[PDB]
Amino acid sequence: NPESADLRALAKHLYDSYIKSFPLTKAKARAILTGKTTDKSPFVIYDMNSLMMGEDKIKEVAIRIFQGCQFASVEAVQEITEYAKSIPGFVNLDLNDQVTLLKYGVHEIIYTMLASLMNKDGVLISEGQGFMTREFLKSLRKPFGDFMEPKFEFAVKFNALELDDSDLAIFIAVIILSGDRPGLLNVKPIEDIQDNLLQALELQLKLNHPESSQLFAKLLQKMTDLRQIVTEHVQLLQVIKKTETDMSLHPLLQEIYKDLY
């Protein structure tokens, strides 16, 4: 019908802008992770020695790996900011609200998109050029040992829903347009866009997974799970900042983390 049509157009437009915005999609990451591709398999990093050999193809070691994640996050935030600008009506909002939405959104979307790069065994890094084992990351000296295990725990549950790129494009758009972010000045227009996106996501989940039973409802439960993971992550960062003085926090990360949960 005509209301359906508009929601299908929005799903198509978000998907396009997702493909442009993000270098490594879930499709490629799956292809690389299965091995069922013609491309060169990724350099596996399972220990200190493998990490050192790995440097070429892609300070204490733990700190080296934390700075790695730091550079990667900053790139993710830039890709996600370009993607938010694609979300119809997002740029038309109050700039201070645009900032507030991204400020609380980016880490939730980073963890959502990290799952596409993850399996129970490890995570693809440097655009699938590397593959860092979960056991290796777990093994790091505290507090760095428990930095990524929560993201692995979430990713195995979230990966069960077998969402595809077209589902994810709308799902991340719905996360960005959250009306309950602290300090928003004009909630109504944000809620109006989220209502359009949520209907678009509902249709997309019925169409793309017609066999799937209340995928849309399970997916909305995961959004509340994501907030809890983003809080815990800020706690460890709060800890790491104070405990390690050899650690420099990237300015862009500082803007986001400043006055957050």
Binding site: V99, L102, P251, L252, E255
Partner: peptide, 10 residues
């Protein structure tokens, strides 16, 4: 949020 402002304005 000058960097965020900058990225949003770019």
């Amino acid at each position: 949020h000058k960097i965020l402002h900058r990225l949003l304005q770019e």
